[PDB]
Design a protein around this ligand. Structure first.
Ligand SMILES: *[C@@H]1O[C@H](CO)[C@@H](O[C@@H]2O[C@H](CO)[C@@H](O[C@@H]3O[C@H](CO)[C@@H](O)[C@H](O)[C@@H]3O)[C@H](O)[C@H]2NC(C)=O)[C@H](O)[C@H]1NC(C)=O
Ligand SMILES: *[C@@H]1O[C@H](CO)[C@@H](O[C@@H]2O[C@H](CO)[C@@H](O[C@@H]3O[C@H](CO)[C@@H](O)[C@H](O)[C@@H]3O)[C@H](O)[C@H]2NC(C)=O)[C@H](O)[C@H]1NC(C)=O
Ligand SMILES: *[C@@H]1O[C@H](CO)[C@@H](O[C@@H]2O[C@H](CO)[C@@H](O[C@@H]3O[C@H](CO)[C@@H](O)[C@H](O)[C@@H]3O)[C@H](O)[C@H]2NC(C)=O)[C@H](O)[C@H]1NC(C)=O
Ligand SMILES: CCCCCCCCCCCCO[C@@H]1O[C@H](CO)[C@@H](O[C@H]2O[C@H](CO)[C@@H](O)[C@H](O)[C@H]2O)[C@H](O)[C@H]1O
Ligand SMILES: CCCCCCCCCCCCO[C@@H]1O[C@H](CO)[C@@H](O[C@H]2O[C@H](CO)[C@@H](O)[C@H](O)[C@H]2O)[C@H](O)[C@H]1O
Ligand SMILES: CCCCCCCCCCCCO[C@@H]1O[C@H](CO)[C@@H](O[C@H]2O[C@H](CO)[C@@H](O)[C@H](O)[C@H]2O)[C@H](O)[C@H]1O
Ligand SMILES: CCCCCCCCCCCCO[C@@H]1O[C@H](CO)[C@@H](O[C@H]2O[C@H](CO)[C@@H](O)[C@H](O)[C@H]2O)[C@H](O)[C@H]1O
Ligand SMILES: CCCCCCCCCCCCO[C@@H]1O[C@H](CO)[C@@H](O[C@H]2O[C@H](CO)[C@@H](O)[C@H](O)[C@H]2O)[C@H](O)[C@H]1O
Ligand SMILES: CCCCCCCCCCCCO[C@@H]1O[C@H](CO)[C@@H](O[C@H]2O[C@H](CO)[C@@H](O)[C@H](O)[C@H]2O)[C@H](O)[C@H]1O
Ligand SMILES: *[C@@H]1O[C@H](CO)[C@@H](O[C@@H]2O[C@H](CO)[C@@H](O)[C@H](O)[C@H]2NC(C)=O)[C@H](O)[C@H]1NC(C)=O
Ligand SMILES: *[C@@H]1O[C@H](CO)[C@@H](O[C@@H]2O[C@H](CO)[C@@H](O)[C@H](O)[C@H]2NC(C)=O)[C@H](O)[C@H]1NC(C)=O
Ligand SMILES: *[C@@H]1O[C@H](CO)[C@@H](O[C@@H]2O[C@H](CO)[C@@H](O)[C@H](O)[C@H]2NC(C)=O)[C@H](O)[C@H]1NC(C)=O
Ligand SMILES: *[C@@H]1O[C@H](CO)[C@@H](O[C@@H]2O[C@H](CO)[C@@H](O)[C@H](O)[C@H]2NC(C)=O)[C@H](O)[C@H]1NC(C)=O
Ligand SMILES: *[C@@H]1O[C@H](CO)[C@@H](O[C@@H]2O[C@H](CO)[C@@H](O)[C@H](O)[C@H]2NC(C)=O)[C@H](O)[C@H]1NC(C)=O
Ligand SMILES: *[C@@H]1O[C@H](CO)[C@@H](O[C@@H]2O[C@H](CO)[C@@H](O)[C@H](O)[C@H]2NC(C)=O)[C@H](O)[C@H]1NC(C)=O
Ligand SMILES: NS(=O)(=O)c1cc(NC(=O)Cc2ccccc2)ccc1Oc1cccc(Cl)c1
Ligand SMILES: NS(=O)(=O)c1cc(NC(=O)Cc2ccccc2)ccc1Oc1cccc(Cl)c1
Ligand SMILES: NS(=O)(=O)c1cc(NC(=O)Cc2ccccc2)ccc1Oc1cccc(Cl)c1
Ligand SMILES: *[C@@H]1O[C@H](CO)[C@@H](O)[C@H](O)[C@H]1NC(C)=O
Ligand SMILES: *[C@@H]1O[C@H](CO)[C@@H](O)[C@H](O)[C@H]1NC(C)=O
Ligand SMILES: *[C@@H]1O[C@H](CO)[C@@H](O)[C@H](O)[C@H]1NC(C)=O
Lengths: 374, 374, 374
């Protein structure tokens, strides 16, 4: 009878048959193991590690602005003023910003033939060691193979390049824009969590416009002013701006957005940390510090092309935004609950082993627990 | 006998002893709870939330191009033509593109001493309130401490800067390049899923070259033309291009790649959404809109250095590509199956509680289910 | 008695009652299924797929430098030298680098009225087909509606643009900087795993400074020299530099950081792969290859504004850094163990089905296993 079988299946309750053993040690051990398992599952997984939540990564957009003006009066270049349009090269970048702190200038360059800068490699005699067509270590010109005089004292191999060639052997010390220590950087950060449809910006609602006009970041006093001083950024990373400015470097400004969305949206706050992303190693490094070469192109009255070659040393400021949001989800909760329910049987397994193999009445309990079908 | 024990272990089947109770209410409740648990585990975890899949994030590369030419005839700068090489500063960026829509120009600047722009702070009398060496709010020059005349009417403090100083108080209205509304942006997006070795590009196979020559994106009609009109991009975000162009802003073009790889590769399509990434708040904001300063450097016939200072207002277009792919994996499937198997015991627990503590024959079932070993 | 009940709960051990059936086939099948389940759970989940680990994504910072000098002697532009400050436009980018390999130059441009380049669309007769105000396909100027003569042979519609207009129909072949094949690229990569507080850089500790001065990457011989040759980068992606240099393209340099942190930190090494991120399709593509337009602005002696329009073809080199680190975690371990414990009951279920429905003594075992409470 299909109907009778269906009724029996629906109208009958099936439960396992249990055997109760009065044993103080085994009972206490079983309860202790179960308590340890429950303490794990609750405290470590749910309360501590937030095992009831789904996680989403952040999508960020960053905007940077710099302020400050520097004054220099040197011999080669004379009195000058450096505003933001001068020392930030280029005017706009993405999640990054380069401030020039030291420079080498080669002005009024022309295409032609000229001697190389004296050194062990370039110095030649009798036009013999020179080889035509070789770019050389400098990669600034192509050798012609004709020894020519650099000055009345020494003679060097000739190259076809922009002339006169750059002499980048003597980096100015102290740095040229050493007042860049005192400039301020404003970081505007807008974040987005697509999974939870949540957006926020690093300028908090209680940060007024009057406050932003005179605040400088300070973890203890002003932990939410998004305006930083470059010297103090470098200092907070454990380094020195003056030392770091002679050859340049890379600094990371690190914004952390690790906020739980089960709470008020006013508690999703950014945390700022600073880290140097360049390494000082004089045995396992190539191209230390940080610099790059760009050129300014002009025209002579005769119509020929001039250029000024700038080797710009400075500090690059990268803005690194990371973090995960968390919101309650039922899938991980049920997974953890089921896993704990499964793990609760380990206590039964261990206690059964102890009862059946580590007692004097281990043959009585074996007879009671196991029923043999001959 | 080790061999006999091994044979018994391998050649004997162990199954629990069950107790069958004829109870309509308890049986129906047990079946209902089990049905609810199974419905959860199947529908919500597998069918709905795709609990049988492994997920991978996308790796994207974006290429942007702009088209359009604008014509202006103003008094200060005269008749001019603005092609792509003019209003896109710089010519190439990464996942970003700036179109200049409004400008302030300061031409023929030189290093020297000049008065500051009149205002409450700069205006001074009798050369008393001026303090030498102070950069000031503008950060455009360093004060010398000598009151000088701006014009026949007012007198302002003197600074050492590029002169004449920029007057950025009167932003032109309407915007200067208000025809940028009508320009078109082409976005080429190539994505990669390293885990699944899957690549695709936003120009679909059925998109021909003839179609791309005259199509403009439209969600209802042309949802897969990757050519957008800037005015319509701003409109689709709920804003106005003309209002947004006076001071500038930031727009995000958001490409979503959320495709299931268990299906045909022709169904992994991009979805475009637009969002404004800058906030209009006149009480909790600093540096609103969007702009930056860059300079053009020239040389006077005498050899001195000139510059033109440009304050460029405009809209930045950021391309944001996100999404996850999904493919069937056995690990999550088995995890979910095991979790459901574990959860199926909650029905037994609850029904046992009801049977042993909420019935008149709760002492008969207790005697039947539990067997005491004295 | 509450105290007595608590003592009984704490001092009594409860274990299920089991039924032992002597059946060779069923016992062997049960053991086989259990062995298969255990083999899965151990080998595939733990040993093979590393199911005992927590995963974190990488945070990377990249720095690129190029070396090489090229020489060209053409008719239009004459003898020239191309150093890094010339062919890298702009001098610095983020996770990217553009090397210019081919160029079209339009020098001494001025604002004014001039004919369009002859073609099917622009060619007009009797000043009839011209429409004033139409930007046209070129988007280089705004039509005035006046037919004008391009030369003694043909006549074209007039536009207001920078003049003379660019003629970008004949791309030079072979490429203009075809010696860029032989340049070298240095990639410096510093990675960070915030979850595990782990940092490393792609220049390994055993890579000395002497080695970096002459090494070129080669997977078989020098798999950890971070200096690459551009021609060999393009070759290792399955393409040709000379063919790819005429119109340009996009190459991805892909750094993989997939290292297990349960082992020594000296085994977290980068793996380099190369992939072309642009597609060659002459039926479903728009704007093939890769190029962009930038301008150089000058001043005529009379004070008017000149410009040189450069259409720069070249190869963009994107650095793509991805990977996940893994460290032992207890949460996934316990989850997998619990899931395996739950799955071990499938063998019991299947064997019970076989015993109770696929035997001649299926009515004896049913009577033995199930005890009915009337
Ligand atoms: C705007 O709202 C934020 C949100 O909290 C306020 O941030 C709070 O700032 C105070 C001090 O400015 C923090 O207390 C400080 O803690 C440091 C230790 O980190 C301690 O050394 C100081 O003596 C002081 O007690 C406070 O923790 C912080 N709130 C949170 C949640 O971290 C802010 O003050 C409000 N106003 C402004 C103008 O930002
Ligand atoms: C190339 O292949 C794509 C792949 O599907 C085709 O996209 C399809 O485009 C049509 C309309 O162009 C979509 O139907 C439209 O849906 C909107 C609602 O979103 C409705 O308002 C319209 O009236 C129309 O019914 C269709 O959904 C879309 N396919 C998918 C999967 O979304 C495309 O048409 C093919 N051809 C070209 C030239 O792109
Ligand atoms: C610095 O330490 C690294 C760390 O291992 C050393 O890398 C090792 O380099 C050798 C060859 O340079 C690799 O062996 C080679 O394998 C290829 C196959 O990929 C084979 O065709 C070659 O004949 C050779 O056997 C070795 O696998 C590699 N180590 C690892 C872990 O991959 C490096 O050699 C050390 N020294 C320098 C100067 O880098
Ligand atoms: C000193 C302090 C001690 C504190 C006391 C200990 C606190 C922790 C008690 C945890 C008790 C767990 O209780 C335990 O639950 C499981 C189910 O989960 C029961 O297990 C029973 O039901 C399940 C289904 O639910 C069956 O598959 C199983 O064969 C059967 O034995 C055990 O019979 C019971 O012992
Ligand atoms: C996120 C965590 C996931 C894991 C969740 C765990 C929940 C599991 C609930 C299990 C419930 C156990 O339910 C309860 O078990 C105890 C034993 O423990 C049973 O108690 C039984 O064994 C004891 C011990 O010998 C006897 O003293 C008692 O007379 C007998 O009835 C109760 O009759 C039952 O009501
Ligand atoms: C009104 C409509 C109602 C629809 C009917 C209900 C549909 C859902 C039925 C789900 C049935 C689950 O069936 C249930 O399976 C578990 C195992 O998973 C069995 O459990 C049995 O085997 C497992 C191992 O597999 C042992 O650990 C356990 O101690 C033992 O009781 C239960 O004895 C049985 O009741
Ligand atoms: C992704 C989902 C993961 C969870 C997967 C769940 C699968 C679990 C399978 C459990 C199989 C249960 O297997 C079946 O259980 C029922 C009870 O339900 C048993 O039935 C037993 O109890 C009932 C109820 O009192 C009696 O009417 C019946 O005579 C008795 O045999 C069957 O003898 C057994 O064949
Ligand atoms: C030919 C080579 C064969 C190799 C032999 C097979 C190797 C694999 C053996 C795996 C044995 C698993 O052993 C199996 O463990 C489970 C618990 O996990 C026991 O299950 C028992 O305890 C659990 C709690 O722990 C109870 O919920 C359950 O109702 C009860 O039956 C089974 O009674 C036992 O059969
Ligand atoms: C990451 C993996 C997660 C899964 C982990 C699995 C661990 C599970 C451990 C289960 C332990 C089983 O524990 C062991 O089970 C066997 C059956 O298998 C029991 O053996 C019982 O059944 C057999 C088979 O009929 C009889 O021959 C035997 O006389 C009887 O005692 C043992 O008395 C018990 O000690
Ligand atoms: C920059 O420094 C130079 C000298 O280092 C200044 O030039 C001299 O200034 C003094 C004091 O005014 C005069 O007496 C000299 O005649 C100036 N010339 C020389 C060659 O010494 C210069 O003035 C400084 N910059 C500015 C803006 O004044
Ligand atoms: C940045 O500003 C500080 C002042 O906050 C400068 O340090 C002071 O400089 C003045 C002269 O300008 C001295 O009189 C003080 O003795 C200095 N110390 C202090 C504590 O005020 C600092 O030199 C500036 N950074 C530069 C110029 O690079
Ligand atoms: C840009 O506008 C100016 C005036 O706003 C134009 O210059 C005048 O044009 C009219 C009409 O051709 C002439 O009659 C005047 O002599 C011109 N000069 C002045 C001072 O008004 C100018 O032509 C416009 N731009 C172009 C390219 O024509
Ligand atoms: C963008 O183009 C539209 C046309 O599609 C311009 O709007 C029209 O402009 C013409 C004159 O150029 C007027 O005659 C029409 O009445 C306008 N409206 C329509 C619906 O065609 C629009 O002005 C252009 N955007 C600019 C110039 O910024
Ligand atoms: C670049 O090539 C041109 C010719 O293609 C060279 O100019 C000629 O060089 C030869 C050989 O020295 C002379 O005899 C001619 O008088 C030169 N002029 C012409 C018009 O042919 C030029 O020298 C080459 N570049 C350099 C740097 O020498
Ligand atoms: C890159 O350098 C290679 C040499 O390693 C050039 O190929 C050689 O060029 C020389 C002349 O410069 C010839 O004599 C050789 O026969 C060429 N082949 C070899 C195997 O050496 C190659 O032309 C250079 N790439 C350029 C110029 O684009
Ligand atoms: N802010 S800016 O306009 O972008 C910008 C500012 C400067 N600054 C100066 O010339 C000041 C100076 C004077 C003397 C020596 C050294 C520096 C230079 C270049 C700038 O632009 C470019 C142009 C081309 C390539 C790149 Cl990479 C950037
Ligand atoms: N497309 S471009 O060549 O990159 C480019 C185009 C323009 N445009 C104009 O000068 C047009 C113009 C005229 C009058 C007023 C305002 C603007 C300016 C600079 C450009 O380049 C640089 C150079 C240095 C730094 C940076 Cl950030 C970018
Ligand atoms: N390295 S650089 O200083 O950045 C740089 C180098 C060059 N190179 C050349 O002019 C060499 C050349 C000569 C003849 C024809 C073609 C090219 C051009 C521009 C550069 O800068 C800008 C400035 C504005 C916008 C952008 Cl996008 C970049
Ligand atoms: C995200 O939330 C905003 C509300 O700020 C809403 O306008 C927008 O439609 C939401 N997006 C999605 C995809 O739900
Ligand atoms: C990815 O797939 C492509 C096929 O388009 C293949 O050439 C390449 O080798 C694959 N990469 C890996 C790592 O398997
Ligand atoms: C990360 O590790 C470094 C050690 O190299 C330590 O100085 C720094 O404080 C650590 N950061 C955190 C957040 O623990």
């Amino acid at each position: 009878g299909c109907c009778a079988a269906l009724a029996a299946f629906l109208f009958e309750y099936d439960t396992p048959r249990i055997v109760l053993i009065r044993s103080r040690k085994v009972g206490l051990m079983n309860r202790a193991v179960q308590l340890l398992i429950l303490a794990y599952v609750i405290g470590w997984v749910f309360v501590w590690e937030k095992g009831y939540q789904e996680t989403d990564s952040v999508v960020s957009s960053v905007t940077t602005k710099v302020k400050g003006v520097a004054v220099t009066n040197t011999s080669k270049l004379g009195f000058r003023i450096w505003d933001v349009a001068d020392y930030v090269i280029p005017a706009q970048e993405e999640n990054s910003l380069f401030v020039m702190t030291n420079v080498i200038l080669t002005m009024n360059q022309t295409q032609g033939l000229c001697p190389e800068i004296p050194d062990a490699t370039t110095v030649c005699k009798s036009d013999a060691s020179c080889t035509a067509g070789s770019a050389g270590t400098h990669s600034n010109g192509v050798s012609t193979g004709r020894c020519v005089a650099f000055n009345g004292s020494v003679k060097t191999c000739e190259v076809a390049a922009w002339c006169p060639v750059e002499d980048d052997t003597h980096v100015p010390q102290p740095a040229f824009l050493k007042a860049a220590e005192n400039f301020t950087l404003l970081v505007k950060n807008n974040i987005w969590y697509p999974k939870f449809n949540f957006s926020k910006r690093n300028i908090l609602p209680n940060i007024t416009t009057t406050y932003l006009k005179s605040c400088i970041y300070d973890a203890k006093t002003d932990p939410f002013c998004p305006i930083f001083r470059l010297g103090k950024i470098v200092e907070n990373a454990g380094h020195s701006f003056q030392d770091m400015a002679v050859e340049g470097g890379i600094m990371g400004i690190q914004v952390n957005w690790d906020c739980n969305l089960d709470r008020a949206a006013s508690l999703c706050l950014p945390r700022y940390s600073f880290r140097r992303l360049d390494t000082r190693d004089v045995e396992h490094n190539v191209s230390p510090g940080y610099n790059f070469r760009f050129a300014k192109y002009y025209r002579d009255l005769a119509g020929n092309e001039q250029r000024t070659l700038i080797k710009a040393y400075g500090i690059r400021f990268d803005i690194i935004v990371f973090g995960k949001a968390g919101k309650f989800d039922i899938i991980p909760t049920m997974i953890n609950i089921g896993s704990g329910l499964a793990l609760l049987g380990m206590a039964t397994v261990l206690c059964d082993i102890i009862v059946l193999y580590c007692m004097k009445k281990r043959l009585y309990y074996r007879e009671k627990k196991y029923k043999y079908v001959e």
